[PDB]
Amino acid sequence: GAMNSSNYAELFNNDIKLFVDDTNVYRVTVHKTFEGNVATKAINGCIFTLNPKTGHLFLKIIHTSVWAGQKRLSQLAKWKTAEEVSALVRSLPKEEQPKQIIVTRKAMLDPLEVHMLDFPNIAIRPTELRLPFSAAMSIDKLSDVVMKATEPQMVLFNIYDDWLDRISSYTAFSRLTLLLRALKTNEESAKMILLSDPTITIKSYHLWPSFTDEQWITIESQMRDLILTEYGRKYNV
Amino acid sequence: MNTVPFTSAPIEVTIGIDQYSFNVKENQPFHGIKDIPIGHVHVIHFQHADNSSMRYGYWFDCRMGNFYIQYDPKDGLYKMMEERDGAKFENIVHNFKERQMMVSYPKIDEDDTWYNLTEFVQMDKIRKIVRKDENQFSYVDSSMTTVQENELSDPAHSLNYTVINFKSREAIRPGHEMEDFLDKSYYLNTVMLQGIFKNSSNYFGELQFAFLNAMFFGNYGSSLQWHAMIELICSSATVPKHMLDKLDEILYYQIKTLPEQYSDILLNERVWNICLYSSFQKNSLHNTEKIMENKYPELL
Numbered sequence A: 001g002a003m004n005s006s007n008y009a010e011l012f013n014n015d016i017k018l019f020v021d022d023t024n025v026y027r028v029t030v031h032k033t034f035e036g037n038v039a040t041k042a043i044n045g046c047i048f049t050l051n052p053k054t055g056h057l058f059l060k061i062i063h064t065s066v067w068a069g070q071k072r073l074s075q076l077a078k079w080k081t082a083e084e085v086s087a088l089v090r091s092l093p094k095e096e097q098p099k100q101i102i103v104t105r106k107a108m109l110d111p112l113e114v115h116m117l118d119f120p121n122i123a124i125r126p127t128e129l130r131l132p133f134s135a136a137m138s139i140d141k142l143s144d145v146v147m148k149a150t151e152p153q154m155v156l157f158n159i160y161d162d163w164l165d166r167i168s169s170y171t172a173f174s175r176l177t178l179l180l181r182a183l184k185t186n187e188e189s190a191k192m193i194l195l196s197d198p199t200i201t202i203k204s205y206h207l208w209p210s211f212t213d214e215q216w217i218t219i220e221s222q223m224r225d226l227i228l229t230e231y232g233r234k235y236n237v
Numbered sequence B: 001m002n003t004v005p006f007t008s009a010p011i012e013v014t015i016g017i018d019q020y021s022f023n024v025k026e027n028q029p030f031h032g033i034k035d036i037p038i039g040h041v042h043v044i045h046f047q048h049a050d051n052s053s054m055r056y057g058y059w060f061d062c063r064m065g066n067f068y069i070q071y072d073p074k075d076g077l078y079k080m081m082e083e084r085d086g087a088k089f090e091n092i093v094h095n096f097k098e099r100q101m102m103v104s105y106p107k108i109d110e111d112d113t114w115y116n117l118t119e120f121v122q123m124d125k126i127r128k129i130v131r132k133d134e135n136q137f138s139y140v141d142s143s144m145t146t147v148q149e150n151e152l153s154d155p156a157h158s159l160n161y162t163v164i165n166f167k168s169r170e171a172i173r174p175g176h177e178m179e180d181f182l183d184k185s186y187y188l189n190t191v192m193l194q195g196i197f198k199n200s201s202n203y204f205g206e207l208q209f210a211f212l213n214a215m216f217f218g219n220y221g222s223s224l225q226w227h228a229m230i231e232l233i234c235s236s237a238t239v240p241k242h243m244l245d246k247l248d249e250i251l252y253y254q255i256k257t258l259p260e261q262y263s264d265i266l267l268n269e270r271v272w273n274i275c276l277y278s279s280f281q282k283n284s285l286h287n288t289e290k291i292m293e294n295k296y297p298e299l300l
């Protein structure tokens, strides 16, 4: 059924599963026309498809050309997402295909179920979690490759960098969701925290800085403080 | 005008014939129903006084044989049977009519209700949905499940309605996933009408039979079938104009005939609001929309 606080450890068992987030597939800027009307200009987007156990991220870049001449773009975006996820699954060897796909927004369920009719044994699930994957475009190198794309392009990363060498996938996912929640609530502060100490660098193929275990605890502490503070500045407590 | 005699009425029972009903006391002399209009299917149905559980009944067409009802005290129900001896049958009927122990099918002359509810319903199609080939009439009851219901347990006793499933490979062409899910015209016109039903008359016949089994027996899977066949049409952008006009008439009379106090259970909020207000055909069901609004404005 739906994924929630109660069945959270299932994410880290040995059944292959993917989270799919479509929040950054169809992206626009809204602007005024010369006549004083409002129009949108699309910008490149991405599907965020993540194995939470391994950290493998399948980042399908959605180039603005896929919207040309199309109507009802927000609805098409859900079907385009579903088409691309279905294509990804079919491209994987059978032993690599997921047993479950968890969508972060319930409106993806019917589009994905229809595109996956050929895979009756893959369960399509919603979640009750309010996961912060929309903030993936606050990760500088992910945002960079999406904005630079001139054609449709599948891009990869281990969103956990090398963390699994030292921590479990439960702990890696918790760190990730805390980082992303922070970036979503106050990107400027969050990025200030992550980069304040010039001596800690980001390896060329890593998305995050090379913190020691001790430095990660300090970092994670600062990210919590931010999330509670912003919640302070928002609600006045 | 044809007749279905009853050997006796040994247990208290509400007897229905089409949209009519007669309430009978234990061993009260209800010996038959006479003056049944020829040219239509009919349904005789029963609800025992002592156990309103299980409405059940028989679909039949008097052109196909001489039929009668006889209570079976072992199986505990009124059973339809065929009398093959024509002289025995006419003699039985004439005696019962002389004692005036047969009620007259109480059709008002102006009244086309039954015709309008059974316009496309044929016995031959009924007998393929209800498989029991040794009989010319078809038994249905409240509890019988449909083929599609059994997929999600006794096959011989199933309602073999045409399986409609909007998230199935039959419904969705590879490469037209979004197109076919949001506009079911391919599924309606090519898969179902051209492929399976052959024409819209057979489609409407099954839709009307599903409704009638839902209404007369509270058969839940029949109600699901009726709503699914409505939804398939309303969710299709391209429907022949004659089918839409006829659908509006069909549904109008079904909504007109529905008991007011059974609307809560027999009408699916989501299908009706979608068909009347959101779907492609939102503007094509004027009669049905007007009666729905004036009779069930709560559902909407």
Ligand SMILES: Cc1ccc(C(C)(C)CN(C)CC(N)=O)cc1
Residues within 6 Å of the ligand: B022, B023, B024, B025, B028, B029, B030, B031, B099, B100, B101, B102, B103
């Ligand atoms: C429930 C119900 C039960 C019985 C009937 C009769 C037709 C027999 C009633 N006859 C008029 C009596 C008679 N002596 O002929 C009608 C309706």
